Design a protein around this nucleic acid. Sequence first.
DNA 1: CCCTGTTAGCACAGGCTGCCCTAATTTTAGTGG
DNA 2: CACTAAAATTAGGGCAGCCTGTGCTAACAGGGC
Lengths: 221, 221, 221, 221
Amino acid sequence: MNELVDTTEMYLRTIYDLEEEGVTPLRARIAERLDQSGPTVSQTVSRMERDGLLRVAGDRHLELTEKGRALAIAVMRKHRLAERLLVDVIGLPWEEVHAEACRWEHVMSEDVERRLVKVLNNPTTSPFGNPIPGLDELGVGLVRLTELPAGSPVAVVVRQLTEHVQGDIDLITRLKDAGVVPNARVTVETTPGGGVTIVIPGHENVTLPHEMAHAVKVEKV
Amino acid sequence: MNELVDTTEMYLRTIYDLEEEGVTPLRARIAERLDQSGPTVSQTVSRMERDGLLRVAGDRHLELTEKGRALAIAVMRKHRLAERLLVDVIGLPWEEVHAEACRWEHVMSEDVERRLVKVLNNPTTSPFGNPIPGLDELGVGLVRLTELPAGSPVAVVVRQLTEHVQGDIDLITRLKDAGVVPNARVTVETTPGGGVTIVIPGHENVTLPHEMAHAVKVEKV
Amino acid sequence: MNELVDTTEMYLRTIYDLEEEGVTPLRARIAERLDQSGPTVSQTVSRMERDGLLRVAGDRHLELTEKGRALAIAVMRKHRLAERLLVDVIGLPWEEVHAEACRWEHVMSEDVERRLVKVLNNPTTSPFGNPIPGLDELGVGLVRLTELPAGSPVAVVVRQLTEHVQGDIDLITRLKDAGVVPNARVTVETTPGGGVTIVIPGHENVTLPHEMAHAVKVEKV
Amino acid sequence: MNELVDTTEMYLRTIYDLEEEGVTPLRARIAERLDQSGPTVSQTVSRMERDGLLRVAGDRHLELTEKGRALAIAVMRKHRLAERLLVDVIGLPWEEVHAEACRWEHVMSEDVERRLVKVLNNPTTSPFGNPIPGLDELGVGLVRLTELPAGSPVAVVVRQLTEHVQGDIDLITRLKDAGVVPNARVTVETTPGGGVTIVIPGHENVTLPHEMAHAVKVEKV
DNA sequence: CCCTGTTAGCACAGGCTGCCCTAATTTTAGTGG
DNA sequence: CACTAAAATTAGGGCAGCCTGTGCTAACAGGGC
Ligand SMILES: [Co+2]
Ligand SMILES: [Co+2]
Ligand SMILES: [Co+2]
Ligand SMILES: [Co+2]
Ligand SMILES: [Co+2]
Ligand SMILES: [Co+2]
Ligand SMILES: [Co+2]
Ligand SMILES: [Co+2]
Ligand SMILES: [Co+2]
Ligand SMILES: [Co+2]
Ligand SMILES: [Co+2]
Ligand SMILES: [Co+2]
Ligand code: NA
Ligand code: NA
Ligand code: NA
Ligand code: NA
């Protein structure tokens, strides 16, 4: 059928994910993350620009238009409501719902959404801690590991694991094994290479590269 | 993204659907049902034949190969397990689950399938009475209105409403309103034009064309 | 490329030719003259009716609409101006120009038409005697052998040989050999089978079937 | 009927035209010139290759087969004999004959060709200077502006204006106004962008892009 | 029968858009010699 | 200022999926002689 299921939507959500991670939305990013060639992401963006879903600014960063953002949210909303349903009701293992939802997010009707809201008791986040956007236009409804000073370790409590980390399954798995998940006290220390090392009381240590770090939100506590 | 989500799968399932209805699997049929041009379905079938999913026989009827059938079933299975999940758990309205499932059927993993089996207590049919196929290769596990003699009406109990009828949403709705659903005593009489008229005690009458009739199974009772 | 070069135009021009011959414009006719199956001419007529070029009446005879006739004339005009150019200037043999122009009639620009008018000195007929139509909307500008009483022969002077006769090349050739051409005194007598026999002083006799006869205009003289 | 009148022939002639201009015959070229999509030209070339009219070489350039070239010439021959007839006899204005012939080239019989030879006194070129090919198979019968060294202007005499230039009507018009036509002394100098500037004694200057330049043959004199 | 159409299924030529790829180049911004 | 890593562009294609125009055959339907 199609790897991504829906190219445009996956481009939009990748744009969004990058913003959520606090990194500059460049075309080069999309290529890395969706594993497509440079020429491809460029030609694809065009079609998208030509359809008023986004604009390539002066510095070349991607800017979502009024329309483009509305949709991007829409997809992200379904995505997370799905991960909820998969973990809570369906009972699918944690380190597997993201990849499943990354597909469902492109077919869930807006109706099934609403009904899922009522069946999960007006949830507000995903099994990974990220908030469910666009909940009201549907009809209802803290730092980043990179923003942590180096030097001496720090005690914090894991609050969010944005989609990007959810991507590397090998890692999202290790993190579960070492308990690094929402509402989990743990200490982190800035590595030499802009990275971050997580010290979990009881389990082996786990180090995240600068990029992966941009995708973990914690609370200084 | 794509109307059908996945063309090939929908062509396979339509082949299957026709068999289930007991009508000969011609390319002309697929074109009607998927609303595509003759040339389109032809060219698409070829690609399919070229990948050994089906063969066009001498009389030109479509025959699913060993491989093709296995996949066709896999789809039909996800389809029905989903309609189950949509009606029972999610709580989505009856005359709406089919259209929703027609899309989910192309993205549900085999894993989510199995778990849905346990969550629904090893169901064996869909909210419309059709059996869930390939349940064992997964890892677990009466007449047709056309075959009804003409003349005087006959009391029967609606047992199945195959996917074809679920298709015409306007009709599947009327049928719900008139109560014509699984385990429902009603009488049927053969119309002049090979059609069939259903007399529901209490609600307006409802007449089905010969084609739609091929898609309703009942039990002489 | 295409036998007819342009299906639609040839259908229009055949309708026109039929009128010119005084026979009823039925779809059956077009099928015979363009050598195409019944189903083909029908479906093609629909496309034409759907584009308002003609209408199928109550008796089923074909009626050219305002638009359809304007175009029809336009083609006939090019066809005849071309036959002129082919015989007078190019110098292509008589019994061959018709077939050539039947193709040129579908590519001659309206401009080349006007200039051909000046190069041939405002002609008004074809090498076969038929009048060049629509000459003013461009920008410038007697009985039928069937309508002849039977019994005793009649002296007449050949005035026109409509396209239909130009069609049968074997016949249009014999007619040339027997001198039966425009401005030629000859006698004709009605045969038993609604046909007609032409008596040419000097050459063998030549008999035309009722149909071919509908395509020859003469002057009682 | 059809924009090109005859796809295959136009493709063949475009291959020829490209060779005549000294540029590599790529599918991408055809697409540009006949204004059709990439996929279209590709699929069409296949039908052509499948019928042994051409072959796509290793470097992907198009090679006309024995048969393919014969036909190609045939079309080019008609095309030019026609431009001759249009200008000399019909009297159609210069910057208009090419477009007309581009259509007549697909319907002129081999007989009408021969006869046009005799009517134009065995011509050997077109009103633009290009030689009339395949004249013997019928039955009868210097540098390129890009190959000109840069630096100081050069006096040359325009000898040919290949079809490609005849295409851009706006340009072929200007060239007439500035007298740049066969047997015309004029000077040309290489522009920075691989282009070429023609200096006509008396009329405004005229600059041709690198591509157009590939389409003009002259004689160093 | 003969003369006219209709109904149902397909074929092949011609055209198109959305997505994706590789081989080169080019364009951006910094970076030390 | 040459040099570069990083990010894009330029060039020429590939395959999946959709369309309309034109043509044909087998079979069947109706009216009138
Ligand atoms: Co996720
Ligand atoms: Co996705
Ligand atoms: Co950073
Ligand atoms: Co269903
Ligand atoms: Co489906
Ligand atoms: Co039946
Ligand atoms: Co004629
Ligand atoms: Co014609
Ligand atoms: Co008559
Ligand atoms: Co020309
Ligand atoms: Co042409
Ligand atoms: Co060049
Ligand atoms: Na890829
Ligand atoms: Na369609
Ligand atoms: Na035919
Ligand atoms: Na085009």
